[PDB]
């Protein structure tokens, strides 16, 4: 028995061992051999060959958390936007090299295989991206931490651009299984929907419900060089399958066909409005997760360690339920439903626990974006919970009635229950009422939250409101995507920087050393060189690897202002055509984003960007002086590829519309300079960086408010400007169209008569900034020197700093960068 | 590339190696731990340690058939009653002792873990047990065979007996993985349905058909120590998953959530009338299968041996198919559609090949049970197919007419299209005409085919109608299930019997060697000994070890007659009660077997048996001289516990009905005397063992036709036999059913007024032959010498004999017990 130990298995740094476990995983686990296998089959085997290493260091850590019994923090998020795992595993796990030499000998190319990897289809935006990065940092600073979410089968669709139009294709990423996850049939949980809340004896009983089964999958995540691997548990919706006879709800009518499919699509569809699925999915992930939670709360030393009930007096001291945005919000009614109805707790205690255990992270600047369910849905499908939500509502509103007595409107502004035609429940007021720390994501964001959107909650509980500025992981977005530069940082300042990023500041004595300058400018040269090459291998274009590489790789939306940059590209077009022998710093401007399904504008904007495209990129006079590419199907894969090759970073959002943003930061670590509004996280970059090193343009938020106040009148701009007057008549007549002229109608008219985002306001200064930017591009040694002053300054934007803060200020655990022993 | 070999990855009969493997798979395959593993878990550590070896030699054998390119055989059966893999594989690869030791040195006991495997529920009775044997014999004869069926997800039902009534629960044996199988997503195939045949220029095209996907799962099958490992490849149906927006059929209406579940439940369950799903299940298993069959004819080297058309002339030399019962008949016009329509042969060069490929095993005698689909039903979902059956039909009837000219009435009887209200297609007659061999599975059976059922097919095609008597593997059904009797037969003659069964006549010497005779009787004392105990441990009763273990395990169906056996037990019950102090040999009667839902008679016989049980097992006057036990959820792993323990095998059907009967045999080899009628495979056992070593009774087929001739009139037997009359009046008054007197009204009435099978008629003769049975049990040295004579004679019943006869007189290949090389 104690001979059934971990001990025996791993020869680590040896190539001959790896060739052996690769050959084992090809032949034995895969049940394939070389006369029939494929790139994908040797791809699986290698990943399985990497995974051995990985689950050994996981057993030891999991084991360790049960021995040393610490605070476990549970990161709830419905999107986990990981994207490709292999190399990332190899770099934090140090096998990077040992595997390449073993694959070369076996006679496979690692890069041929690493690109077979589909991005993990659990994700969409800078919500789930953030989640995946945070998890890296949770491991690297050694927190006993679980991230939970749903396992979706179909991701967020794959983009096809057909004729300059976006087509939605599907991401059936798990088509061939997923070698990293481990399925748990043993751990299937029931989740309940529907019901009837019968009130009886000591409480009430949720009776007669439909059940669905959440089956967990375990995907491990490995800390940077520190021998901790933690977990990512995700849940699959499974039907009970009596469906044919038992219960004898069938025989007669098998319309339970539906029970089962409406079940099955809880886990199918990821979401890009009020659809009862979205609520079934949120709840699903929450209910299953809280049962695995309290399950370990009781199990770890505590099913033993009771004193009274295995009382949840120490549930705050041992569990942390992190609500990433209102999508997890039924975690506060479902912990009080579990603690008050199934355990036999009473309200005031059960609340002391919810609140002391729970924390909320908000990611939206404007009141409209926040979640609110219609109360009849909750009443039909989640009854028990709508009672609890209303008791919570009652009570929190007697706290504000205690505090600010006699006010009527505060009670009616802060209420969880919104009145109106279509009565609602405001999930952000649930989470604020039920969480012990609320927090933002950039300095300005957390302050408008404190000063406009939640200030009635702010002055009841100022103590609650925190800020915890977003960040990036130096693993994924430096060492990994851009080794060339990680390397010339290594020799100058050490290796400690990847586990400690504020050390980059040491680079700031080497500002002037011409040796480093050329190295830094060499790496970028190599990078654009490479991108120009993937861009013309996987797809094709007539790039200039030397040109100013301009990128805007944002979600395609109106407040993210792709049109502000298209007007500026048609401004340089119109100059290079009006004066063909004038020196214009050549640019190749690339814009990527997937639209958002049927957002009319956005789909029309991608078609505009491929219009400028077919026009200027094909004109003879334009030459190679200017070029426009729309980057197809932007994703983690792809940012790892283009973020390295960028010189200028297009963070141009209307002042006050981005709550933070994180590609912003990514671009700064990769040595690129930002042209952006004084908004989001651009504030703290510029503040760290020196505004002298940053390109801030555009109206500050003051200037916005005021123009709304006096009236934005688009037209007036149009008329005191000739290049703008011109470019809009161009679009209009059909300059960029001509097989249907009248096609850009709705953009020419939106911009011109009804732009909510003020494009024309910033147009005079945006090009008068873009010129400065092109002048210093055309100065080599200082371009590279603005850059280093940015790179050196990158520190505060490492997610490790964001998790140390959560750790000590919202959660209550120190971090630790001490490398576990083991395997 | 050559560097990626099967080679370095083993140690085989090596304790220390297997204990090392077990620890990897528990912690790296299972990502479990000793601190967390279940019993269920240590069998996936062990079953995975035993699978490495099982697949290394599969790697090798399959390469070995591509290079050797032998004619290949494919057993098409809709049911493979596999059932428990750990030990058959341990003992077919000879790692049982080495494993027992490893797991033993680790500190688990191997027997514990063996019983956690749930039987691989892909079968149901005779038909499907058989197929499973033929795979172990066909591997053992080093033949290049294949097993292709549907993977049923829910098998068929698990039997629960509640209130002495049969409850059918669901078998989701697939609950925590089946480690013996390998999912191959990547060989998924389109199986086509409904549609229309558009006849264009050079033929017809089958257009507009719904498609369902056929996913394969690979289970290696290890021959006995001859290093071959073949494949059973079962197919899992699956919905296309375009069902959401991709197709523009949905969006607006997902009522084809239905298509999706009607498609998945082709693989969902076994069956258990003209049902659209049975035909769907039949076509499905055939079609994905005939594309692997034709694929390997093209891809298995023969793509470079094309000579002409990659000729399908070399198809019956190098492929062979078996229709195991009419459940794959659509393989014949499915093949003619693939050759003529999809390839491009003319209809004779396509038929020559088809009739030279198909050979079809039969197992039915009664007309009423031959397969017959309605032609409208073939029109709707297989329109091309019923066009091709009609071609076959025209011509086959023109052959027939060339031959029996003038006879119209023969023409109207031999056709594949039956007429009445609802015209049907005689799937029996399709099978015969599209084949180069038809064969019953027992001599009395093959002849009744030629004589009465298939006769006009034998005057026309005499040569075609062969026979190949059923048989059983010796490895599962004597070595694996009887290590004790395996041991002492080894002592007196060594192994070649296990691989060569008529070698057991050598035992006829030892008939009077007192060592032998103490040892055969001792082994049985101990098999009964452990079974008395599970009959206490896993379910409950107080068994007397020292009783005549009288067993009857059949399909609970009227003609199989457990109501003849119920009447003899009520007759001992009565006897032992009228005279409590007469020495009557003590017996344990045990009946088990599934009803099959909705058959009311059967469901009432299962209750009858348990009613009688409750009465005699609680009657104090009785003591342990008599006990009636219903064994529940009879399946392959019970059959392997109950058969070692049986002393009397009751093979009692109505004379003429059983066509053969694979279990008849299992008992003989396991030393139990057979009581039974002269029919089926009793016929060639009472011939092999000599009649007087058999308890043959009752009416012969002769006198059953005779009884029908003067008309069987139940009441006259009622009016002479005075113990009968007594049990009928006991049944009716509710002696056995006190709370509902009238509960067996149906059974009584049945017997008495409309018993199709002549139970009363065989009642005097059966009670007297049993009197002679308890007499001979009352004398241990002679009952044991009978037993020695029945075991000495088992040889004619190996599946190695039957398969040989297949290979040589039908499939045309040669068996070989020669070792293939490997690991
Ligand atoms: N009682 C325990 N003692 C030690 N380690 C444990 C214990 N329970 C769970 N673990 C560890 O945690 C893993 C399971 O994680 P969980 O899903 O949290 O139960 C096990 O495989 C061990 O690595
Ligand atoms: N061309 C081939 N040469 C050697 N071995 C082969 C070849 N094709 C198939 N095999 C072997 O046969 C197994 C089954 O092949 P398949 O018929 O493709 O399922 C493969 O997994 C290999 O072990
Ligand atoms: C970093 C990243 C994002 C983040 O979007 P922002 O608007 O930059 O915060 C989105 N998608 C991908 C693929 C990313 O790599
Ligand atoms: C052999 C076997 C059968 C065969 O039934 P017969 O009555 O013998 O034809 C049925 N069930 C199991 C479990 C078997 O192994």
CATH of the domain at A146: 3.40.50.2000
State whether residue A299 sits within 8 Å of chain B by CB. no
Which value, to the nearest 10 degrees, does the dihedral of the CA atoms of residues A377, A381, A383, A389 take?
-50
For residue A206, give Cα distances in angstroms to A239, A636, B647: 20, 43, 56
Strand pairing class (B72-76; B145-150): parallel
CA distance B581 to A396: 85
CA distance B796 to B501: 7
| Structure-block tokens of residue A252 | 């007669």
CA distance B434 to B461: 12
Whether residues B587 and B511 fall in one domain? yes
Q: Looking at the partner chain, which of A27, A182, A261 has a beta carbon nearest the beta carbon of B257?
A: A261
CB environment B194-224: b (16+ within 10 A), e (fewer):
ebebeeeeeebbbeebbbbbbbbbbbbbbbb
Q: Which residue's entry shows tokens 């209102």? A: A326
* SS3 state at A644: coil
Q: Do you find a cis peptide bond into B531, omega within 30 degrees of 0?
A: no
Whether residues B238 and B358 fall in one domain? yes
CA distance B47 to B88: 12
Using the mean position of ligand 4's atoms as its centre, give its distance from the Cα of residue B632 in Å. Answer: 14
Is A695 marked within a binding site? Answer: no
Whether residues B446 and B520 fall in one domain? no
For residue A503, give Cα distances in angstroms to A94, A663, B263: 22, 21, 60
Whether residues B424 and B503 fall in one domain? no
- Please spell the DSSP secondary structure of B649-686, one letter per residue: EEE---TT-----TTHHHHHTT--EEEEES-TTTTTHH
B376, B417 in Cβ contact below 8 A? Answer: no
Range of the domain at A562: 472-798
For residue A29, give Cα distances in angstroms to A41, A117, B56: 11, 19, 11
Burial group, residue A708, by CB count within 10 angstroms (0-12, 13-18, 19+): exposed
Q: Which helix or strand (DSSP H or E) is residue B472 part of?
A: none
Q: Which helix or strand (DSSP H or E) is residue B811 part of?
A: none
Whether residues B482 and B522 fall in one domain? yes
State whether residue A455 sits within 8 Å of chain B by CB. no
For residue B147, the tally of other CB atoms under 10 A from its CB is 25
For residue A259, give Cα distances in angstroms to A215, A256, A490, B685: 17, 5, 57, 54
**CB neighbour list of residue A45: distance below 8 Å, 6 or more residues apart:** A22, A23, A25, A26, A29, A30
Whether residues A504 and A449 fall in one domain? no
Q: How many domains does chain B have?
A: 2
CA distance A651 to A666: 12
Q: How was this structure determined?
A: X-ray
Q: Which residues pair with B372 in a beta bridge?
A: B426
Taking an 8 Å cut-off on Cβ atoms, the answer to whether A19 and B3 are in contact is: yes
Q: What share of chain A is helix, strand, coil (3-state, %, to 5)?
A: 50, 15, 35
Q: Residue B579: phi, psi to the nearest 5?
A: -130, 65
Taking an 8 Å cut-off on Cβ atoms, the answer to whether B269 and A244 are in contact is: yes
Strand pairing class (B196-198; B205-207): antiparallel
For residue B395, give Cα distances in angstroms to B312, B352, B354, B381, B388: 21, 13, 14, 24, 11
Which residues sit directly before a break in chain B (C to N > 2.5 Å)?
Answer: 272
CA distance A767 to A755: 19
State whether the Cα torsion A14-A15-A20-A22 is positive or negative.
positive
B10, B823 in Cβ contact below 8 A? Answer: yes
For residue B726, give Cα distances in angstroms to A424, B616, B729, B730, B745: 77, 16, 5, 6, 15
Q: Which residue's entry shows tokens 């994700």? A: A123
Whether residues A725 and A812 fall in one domain? no
Counting other chains too, the contacts that B31-36 makes at CB distance below 8 Å and 24 or more residues apart are B31/A55, B31/A58, B31/A59, B31/A182, B31/A218, B33/A6, B33/A59, B33/A62, B33/A63, B34/A1, B34/A2, B34/A4, B34/A5, B35/A63, B35/A66
Whether residues A384 and A527 fall in one domain? no
Half-sphere exposure (Cβ direction) of A176: Cα atoms closer than 13 Å: 14
| Structure-block tokens of residue B320 | 């062979």
A823, A56 in Cβ contact below 8 A? Answer: yes
- Which residues line ligand 3 at a C-beta cut-off of 6 Å? A 125-126, 129, 554-555, 634-636, 639, 661-663, 666
- Please spell the DSSP secondary structure of A664-700, one letter per residue: HHHHHHTS-EEEE-S-TTHHHHHHHH-GGGSEE-S--
Whether residues B458 and B525 fall in one domain? no
- Which residues in chain A have Cβ-Cβ distances shorter than 8 Å to B61? none
B802, B41 in Cβ contact below 8 A? Answer: no
Q: Which residue's entry shows tokens 């040295």? A: B781
Q: Which of A167, A151, A261, A302 is nearest to A214 (CA)?
A: A151
Residues in chain A: 823
Tell me how many degrees the CA angle A147-A151-A156 measures, rounded to the nearest 5.
110
Q: Residue B405: phi, psi to the nearest 5?
A: -60, 155
* SS3 state at A180: coil
Q: Residue B336: phi, psi to the nearest 5?
A: -60, -30
Q: At what angle do helices A39-68 and A15-24 cross, to 10 degrees?
A: 110
Q: Looking at the partner chain, which of B168, B261, B268 has a beta carbon nearest the beta carbon of A257?
A: B261
Which value, to the nearest 10 degrees, does the dihedral of the CA atoms of residues A699, A700, A703, A707 take?
60
DSSP A747: H
Catalytic, A610? Answer no
- Please spell the DSSP secondary structure of A543-565, one letter per residue: --TTSEEEEEES---GGGTHHHH
State whether residue B52 sits within 8 Å of chain A by CB. yes
A616, A573 in Cβ contact below 8 A? Answer: yes
Which value, to the nearest 10 degrees, does the dihedral of the CA atoms of residues B103, B107, B112, B118 take?
-60
Catalytic, B20? Answer no
**CB neighbour list of residue A598: distance below 8 Å, 6 or more residues apart:** none
B144: left (phi over 0), alpha (psi -120 to 50) or beta: beta
- Please spell the DSSP secondary structure of B413-448, one letter per residue: HHSSEE-SSS-EEEHHHHHHHT-S-EEESSHHHHHH
Ligand nearest to the CA of B560: 4
DSSP B591: E
State whether residue A187 sits within 8 Å of chain B by CB. no
Radius of gyration of chain A (CA): 28
Tell me how many degrees the CA angle A156-A158-A161 measures, rounded to the nearest 5.
135
Atom of ligand 3 nearest to the CA of A637: 13
Tell me how many degrees the CA angle B794-B797-B799 measures, rounded to the nearest 5.
135
Q: Which residue's entry shows tokens 């011509």? A: B395
Q: What share of chain B is helix, strand, coil (3-state, %, to 5)?
A: 50, 15, 35
Q: Which of B352, B415, B55 is nearest to B231 (CA)?
A: B55
- Please spell the DSSP secondary structure of A579-594, one letter per residue: STTS----EEEEEE--
CA distance A39 to A50: 16
A119, A137 in Cβ contact below 8 A? Answer: no
- Please spell the DSSP secondary structure of A120-151, one letter per residue: -SS--STTHHHHHHHHHHHHHTT-EEEEEEE-
Q: Residue A656: phi, psi to the nearest 5?
A: 95, 10
Q: Which helix or strand (DSSP H or E) is residue B486 part of?
A: helix B483-493
CA distance B197 to A533: 50
Q: Which of A611, A607, A605, A731 is nearest to A162 (CA)?
A: A607
For residue A42, give Cα distances in angstroms to A112, B29, B180: 10, 18, 22
State whether the Cα torsion A263-A269-A275-A278 is positive or negative.
positive
Is A641 marked within a binding site? Answer: no
Whether residues B466 and B495 fall in one domain? no
CB environment B780-795: b (16+ within 10 A), e (fewer):
eeebbbbbbbbbbbbb
Give Cα A76 distance to the centre of its chain. 13
B430, B323 in Cβ contact below 8 A? Answer: no
Q: Which of B44, B54, B59 is nearest to B90 (CA)?
A: B54
B56, B823 in Cβ contact below 8 A? Answer: yes
Taking an 8 Å cut-off on Cβ atoms, the answer to whether A1 and B182 are in contact is: no
Per-residue three-class SS string for B732-794? HHCCCCCCCHHHHHHHHHHHHHHCCCCCHHHHHHHHHHHHHHHHHHCCHHHHHHHHHHHHHCH
Give the B window 194-223 contacts with A, CB below 8 Å: 218
Residues in chain B: 823
**CB neighbour list of residue A315: distance below 8 Å, 6 or more residues apart:** A294, A297, A353, A357
| Structure-block tokens of residue B788 | 């020695």
Q: Which residue's entry shows tokens 């049993």? A: B770
Q: Which residues pair with B728 in a beta bridge?
A: none
- Which residues in chain B have Cβ-Cβ distances shorter than 8 Å to A8? 20, 23-24
CA distance B123 to B747: 30
For residue A712, give Cα distances in angstroms to A387, A654, A745, A760: 46, 13, 21, 10
Radius of gyration of chain B (CA): 28
State whether residue A255 sits within 8 Å of chain B by CB. no
Whether residues A467 and A516 fall in one domain? no
Whether residues B410 and B480 fall in one domain? no
| Structure-block tokens of residue B500 | 């060569």
Instruction: Starting at the earlier edge strand, list the strands of the sheet with A417-418.
Output: A372-374, A424-426, A417-418
CA distance B647 to B548: 6
- Please spell the DSSP secondary structure of B292-311, one letter per residue: HHHHHHHHTTTTTS-TTTT-
CB environment B64-103: b (16+ within 10 A), e (fewer):
bbeeeebbbbbbbbbbbbbbbbbbbbbbbbebbebbebbb
CA distance A622 to A570: 12
* SS3 state at B196: strand
Strand pairing class (A144-150; A72-76): parallel
* SS3 state at B468: coil
Is B739 marked within a binding site? Answer: no
- Which residues line ligand 2 at a C-beta cut-off of 6 Å? A 32-33, 35-36; B 59, 62-63, 66, 296
- Please spell the DSSP secondary structure of A65-118, one letter per residue: HHHH---EEEEE-S-------HHHHHHHTS-HHHHHHHHHHHT--HHHHHTTPP
Q: Which helix or strand (DSSP H or E) is residue B69 part of?
A: none
Q: Which residues pair with A144 in a beta bridge?
A: A72
């Amino acid at each position: 028995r104690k001979q059934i130990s971990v001990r025996g298995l791993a020869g680590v740094e040896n190539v001959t061992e790896l060739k052996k476990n690769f050959n084992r995983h090809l032949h034995f686990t895969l049940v394939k051999d070389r006369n029939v296998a494929t790139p994908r089959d040797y791809y699986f085997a290698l990943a399985h060959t990497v995974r051995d290493h990985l689950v050994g260091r996981w057993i030891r850590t999991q084991q360790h958390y049960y021995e040393k019994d610490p605070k476990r923090i549970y990161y709830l998020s419905l999107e986990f936007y990981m994207g490709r795992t292999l190399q990332n595993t190899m770099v934090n796990l140090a096998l990077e090299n040992a595997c390449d030499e073993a694959t070369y000998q076996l006679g496979l190319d690692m890069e041929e295989l690493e690109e077979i990897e589909e991005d993990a289809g659990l994700g969409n935006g800078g919500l789930g991206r953030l989640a995946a990065c945070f998890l890296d940092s949770m491991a690297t600073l050694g927190l006993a931490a679980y991230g939970y979410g749903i396992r979706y089968e179909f991701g967020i669709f794959n983009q096809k651009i057909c004729g300059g139009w976006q087509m939605e294709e599907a991401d059936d990423w798990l088509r061939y299984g997923n070698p990293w996850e481990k399925a748990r049939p043993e751990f299937t949980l029931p989740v309940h929907f529907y019901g009837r809340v019968e009130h009886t004896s000591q409480g009430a009983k949720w009776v007669d419900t439909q059940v669905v089964l959440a089956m967990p999958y375990d995907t491990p995540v490995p800390g940077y060089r520190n021998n901790v691997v933690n977990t990512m548990r995700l849940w699959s919706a499974k039907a009970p399958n009596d469906f044919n006879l038992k219960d004898f709800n069938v025989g007669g009518y098998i319309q339970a066909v539906l029970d089962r499919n409406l079940a099955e699509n809880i886990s199918r569809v990821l979401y890009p409005e009020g659809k009862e699925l979205r609520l079934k999915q949120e709840y699903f992930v929450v209910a299953a997760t809280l049962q695995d939670i309290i399950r370990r709360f009781k199990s770890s030393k505590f099913g033993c360690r009771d004193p009274v009930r295995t009382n949840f007096d120490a549930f705050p001291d041992k569990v942390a339920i992190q609500l990433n945005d209102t999508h997890p919000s039924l975690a506060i009614p479902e912990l009080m439903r579990v603690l008050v109805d199934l355990e036999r707790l009473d309200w005031d205690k059960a609340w002391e626990v919810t609140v002391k255990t729970c924390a909320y992270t908000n990611h939206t600047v404007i009141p409209e974006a926040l979640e609110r369910w219609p109360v009849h849905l909750l009443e039909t499908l989640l009854p028990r919970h709508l009672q609890i939500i209303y008791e919570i509502n009652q009570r929190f509103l007697n706290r504000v009635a205690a505090a600010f007595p006699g006010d009527v409107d505060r009670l009616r502004r802060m209420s969880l229950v919104e009145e109106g035609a279509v009565k609602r429940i405001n999930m952000a007021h649930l989470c604020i009422a039920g969480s012990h720390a609320v927090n933002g994501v950039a300095r300005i964001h957390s302050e408008i939250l404190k000063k406009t959107i939640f200030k009635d909650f702010y002055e009841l509980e100022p103590h609650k409101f925190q800020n915890k500025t977003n960040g990036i992981t130096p693993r994924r977005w430096l060492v990994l995507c851009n080794p060339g530069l990680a390397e010339i940082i290594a020799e100058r300042i050490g290796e400690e920087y990847i586990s400690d990023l504020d050390q980059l500041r040491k680079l700031l004595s080497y500002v002037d050393d011409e040796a480093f300058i050329r190295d830094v400018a060499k790496v970028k040269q190599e990078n654009k060189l490479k991108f120009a090459a993937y861009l013309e291998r996987e797809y094709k274009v007539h790039i200039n690897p030397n040109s100013l590489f301009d990128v805007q790789v944002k979600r395609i939306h109106e407040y993210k202002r792709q049109l502000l940059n298209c007007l500026h590209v048609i401004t340089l077009y119109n100059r290079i055509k009006k004066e063909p022998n004038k020196f214009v710093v050549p640019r190749t401007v690339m814009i990527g984003g997937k639209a958002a399904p049927g957002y009319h504008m956005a789909k029309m904007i991608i078609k505009l960007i491929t219009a400028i495209g077919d026009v200027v990129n094909h004109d003879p006079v334009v030459g190679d002086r200017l070029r426009v590419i729309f980057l197809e199907n932007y994703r983690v894969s792809l940012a790892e590829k283009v973020i390295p090759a960028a010189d200028l970073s297009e963070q141009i959002s209307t002042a006050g519309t981005e709550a933070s943003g994180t590609g912003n930061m990514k671009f700064m670590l990769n040595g690129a300079l930002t042209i952006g509004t004084m908004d989001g996280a651009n504030v703290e970059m510029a503040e760290e960086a020196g505004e002298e090193n940053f390109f801030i343009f555009g109206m500050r938020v003051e200037d916005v408010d005021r123009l709304d106040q006096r009236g934005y009148n688009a037209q007036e701009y149009y008329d005191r400007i000739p290049e703008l007057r011109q470019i809009i008549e161009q679009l209009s007549s059909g300059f960029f169209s001509p097989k249907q002229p009248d096609l850009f109608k709705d953009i020419v008219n939106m911009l011109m008569h009804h732009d909510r985002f003020k494009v024309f306001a910033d147009y005079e200064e945006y090009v008068k900034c873009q010129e400065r930017v092109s002048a210093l591009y055309k100065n080599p040694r200082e371009w590279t020197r603005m850059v280093i002053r940015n790179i050196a300054t990158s520190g505060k934007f490492s997610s490790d700093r964001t998790i140390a803060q959560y750790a000590r200020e919202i959660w209550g655990v120190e971090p630790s960068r001490q490398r576990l022993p083991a395997p």
